[PDB]
Amino acid sequence: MQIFVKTLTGKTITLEVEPSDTIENVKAKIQDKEGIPPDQQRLIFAGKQLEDGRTLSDYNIQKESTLHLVLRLRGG
């Protein structure tokens, strides 16, 4: 399935994934494309901060969903 990731600079990252992929699978795929390490990524679906070992299915994430990408800071 195709999902859509929106970054703070407004970049649209388009990812083929499958619903049983993890949010750490997501973080690795985006690094492959944009050079961002998973450690600095925080990922938000519908106001909710997403946790790494959980699956896209478990969050109710399916095709054509908008997900949002945040950079974690130094102090936080």
Curated annotation (Swiss-Prot):
Domain Ubiquitin-like: 1-76
Residues carrying Phosphoserine: S65
Coiled coil: none
Effect listed in the UniProt record for changing R74K: No effect on ADP-ribosylation
Post-translational modification: Phosphorylated at Ser-65 by PINK1 during mitophagy. Phosphorylated ubiquitin specifically binds and activates parkin (PRKN), triggering mitophagy. Phosphorylation does not affect E1-mediated E2 charging of ubiquitin but affects discharging of E2 enzymes to form polyubiquitin chains. It also affects deubiquitination by deubiquitinase enzymes such as USP30. Mono-ADP-ribosylated at the C-terminus by PARP9, a component of the PPAR9-DTX3L complex. ADP-ribosylation requires processing by E1 and E2 enzymes and prevents ubiquitin conjugation to substrates such as histones.
Site (Interacts with activating enzyme): R54, R72
Effect of K63R: Abolishes HLTF-mediated polyubiquitination of PCNA
Compartments (UniProt record): Cytoplasm; Nucleus
Cross-link (Glycyl lysine isopeptide (Gly-Lys) (interchain with K-? in acceptor proteins)) at residue(s): G76
Biological role: Exists either covalently attached to another protein, or free (unanchored). When covalently bound, it is conjugated to target proteins via an isopeptide bond either as a monomer (monoubiquitin), a polymer linked via different Lys residues of the ubiquitin (polyubiquitin chains) or a linear polymer linked via the initiator Met of the ubiquitin (linear polyubiquitin chains).
Name the UniProt record assigns to this protein: Ubiquitin
Name of encoding gene: UBA52
Residue window of the full protein shown: 1 to 76 of 128
